[PDB]
RNA sequence: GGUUGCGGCCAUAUCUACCAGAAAGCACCGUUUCCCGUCCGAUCAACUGUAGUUAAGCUGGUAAGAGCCUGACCGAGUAGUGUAGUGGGUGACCAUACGCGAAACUCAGGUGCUGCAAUCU
RNA sequence: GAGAACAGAAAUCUCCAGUAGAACAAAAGGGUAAAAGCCCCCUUGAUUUUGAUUUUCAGUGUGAAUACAAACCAUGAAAGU
RNA sequence: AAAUAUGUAAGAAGUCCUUGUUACUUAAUUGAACGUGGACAUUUGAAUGAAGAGCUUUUAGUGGGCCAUUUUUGGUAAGC
């Protein structure tokens, strides 16, 4: 009935791992009014630096 | 049976400090937050809209999303054998900036300044911190501080 | 002495606790209209007492608060019913005072043979000029100890006015 | 009371003990959208003392508020208004002065003239196309109670006529009938100029002819009759549009001779 | 330096009780025709700075004051507590070794500081 | 607490003190004083579209909440909500 | 208001200068986010260790547990 013996040893056998951050996190949870404009800003920056 | 509410076992955690009740002072609504700022989570029971859970009280996270009257933060949380990234939407009154970063930022500024000083002056400097080294040789003098002899103290009449 | 120091009258509230609710209540309303000129207001019941027969939220009493020049006129015609003989116990610790008459006809009104017979509660509160600092909204404050009105200053003003011979008992 | 009372007593804020600031109102007037990070949120502060009107434009930082532009009613003698400086028309002219002064400070006084020939209609400062948007200030009427026809909406009307884009509605201006839900512009214009003062002047000229002098003793001594108030306020508004820049009063002393005299009476330790 | 408007930190700012405020400001104050609101122009609204006053508000001093804040050869290296022993004791508990280490108290000191704009002998 | 005809322990009115000792539908805990309490006015955001997130958690469902987006509205002088 | 225990940070995905994008934001040629081009790339900004770091697929057994120190709750008390 919920004996927490051996659970920390089981947790620390295969390590307790960090979530492995990256550059460019996902824009799925951010403000959609900002994300809609950030799409157009990235597109305009790409079209500017393409013909340079 | 046992209960697991949203605010269970939270009697002392979400209560205002002694002689600190009432309205929130206006500095909290004027501190600005950008994406990437590291903030502490410290809820108050006065504003019930946008509270964190009782787990996240005291945890430090990184702002990922700024909108009207509330910021969203990212907190690693250990469940089982690994950490999960929890994204959570807090009002500003449960958020204080972390001053743990604003020693490192000013330290970067200071050592970049003295590194640019030394590399154009013609000397060598260290930029790493060091732990408390052992003490050095000193000659303790005896002019006013003549060593007063101490003795252990007896027990009778002290009782 | 000094201006902004005189115990000017502030308001005189006339009050009648009818105890019941009905035709004498509506009559006493017209009595206070014929006396004051202003329309009066009725008050509800705070609590419930079975032995006095009033329940929660029932209009039982009529009062009207008069100010300005007619307040001391009604005060004079109410004092000449008591023959200008007031007690010392009627004066409160904050310097306001009142009394109660048993017949409401002998003020100077005309008599009606149908509107009922009742007494009336006179109460008058007065203070020196400058008590807007408590009653206003922005920047409230309490009047100073030298400017507060007490029982001794009120009975001194009542002795100087009207040649009262207030009872000190 | 007790030691146990005074140890557990929590005093409120200082400008709440003084009774000067409503923090419940100030939170929502100052607190801004977090996605506009350092954008200042300007408040048109209108305050009424017993013989002066204070119209300031005020932003807010953590180290106290910051005044962008202020305009007082005791500089209206530079434009023509002498008597009745806590007037409805004087509140209008003060709001017009702070609007013209703020737009001259920013550089929008040529693009946003507002309305110049005022008839009392309800009209908001519409944005011009392919240019800058108008300056945006939010009015805050202190601890002052809002009633329809109050003086503090005269400064609102004056700022919106000067072209300061204060968002508002018409249902607190004088002349707004609560039955037809419509305003009377021929009454609002009569309050914008001197109509409700001048009408009382000509009524007291033949109803109580000494109380007329005891009220308008400055008007009779300065030879201002009832009908000239319109001509006073119109040329006053024209002078305000002409030169609204703020030049300070020339000081008698340079604030050290002031301090040397004020330290004499200050009763220090 | 005085004052006003808007403030920041929100008692070193509060509470209690006397005294003083030049100038300017603020305030009390004067009056209901109009906008407005009331049992009541008392609050609120409007008009006049005109008849008056520092009496109050406010500000500043004063107090073996209550509180509040700060500091330590204060309490005290005390209570508590992490680690160790085939330590002691029948036991409750205790001592020792390596560490961390309070609090109420006691004494001393203090009683708002400051930002923006305007104005004043 | 001090006062006022009947009127008192306890009906109505007036002043003074009053950091919440009241009230907030209901358990207990938290919160709240120009309010979140008490009165008054106007209303239907107790609405439409589906997403993201927190809690219990397998990071499944159910329940309940949180912050926005695109509409349409309410209220207020307004910021706002 | 401890002791023990606990979140985060200690840089190259960093810091600074300049000016490009945007339908977002601003009274605004303001800001936000992502950038271009330069500069610092020496101690790449505490200690110690690293016996490689990261990732994926698939599957067995298990899903009756007990004892000791310390804290503790029902319990007169236990090998409760």
Author numbering:
A (entry chain a): 6 to 57
B (entry chain T): 2 to 160
C (entry chain E): 6 to 174
D (entry chain P): 8 to 276
Question: What does the original paper state about this entry?
Answer:
Following their assembly in the nucleus, pre-60S ribosomal subunits are exported to the cytoplasm where they are converted to translation-competent particles. Analysis by single-particle cryo-EM with extensive 3D classification yielded a series of structures (hereafter termed states I-VI) that likely reflect sequential snapshots of final cytoplasmic pre-60S maturation. Sequential maturation of the cytoplasmic pre-60S subunit couples dramatic conformational rearrangements of two long flexible helices (the L1 stalk and H38) to recruitment of the final ribosomal proteins (eL40 and uL16) and assembly factor displacement. In conclusion, we have used single-particle cryo-EM to demonstrate the conformational changes during cytoplasmic 60S subunit maturation that couple incorporation of the ribosomal proteins eL40 and uL16 to the release of Nmd3 in what is likely to be a universal mechanism in eukaryotes.
In states I-III, the L1 stalk is displaced inwards with H38 in the ‘closed’ position. In addition, we identified density corresponding to the phosphatase and zinc finger domains of Yvh1 situated between uL11 in the P-stalk and eIF6 (states I-II). Focused classification around the P-stalk revealed that Yvh1 is predominantly bound in state I, is present at low occupancy in state II but is absent in state III. Although there is clear density for uL11 (state I) at the base of the P-stalk, uL10 was poorly defined in our maps, consistent with the paucity of uL10 protein in the Lsg1-TAP particles as detected by immunoblotting. While the overall structures of Rei1 and Reh1 are consistent with previous reports, our maps reveal additional density that corresponds to the N-termini of both Rei1 and Reh1 extending up across the surface of eL24 to directly interact with eIF6 subdomains C and D and with a loop that extends out from the α-helical domain of Lsg1 (residues G438-T456) (state I). The timing of the exchange of Rei1 for Reh1 (between states I-II) is consistent with XL-MS analysis that yielded crosslinks between Rei1, Arx1 and eL24, while Reh1 yielded crosslinks to eL24, but not to Rei1 or Arx1. Focused classification around the H89 density revealed that in the absence of eL40 (states I-II), H89 adopts a range of conformations even with Yvh1 present.
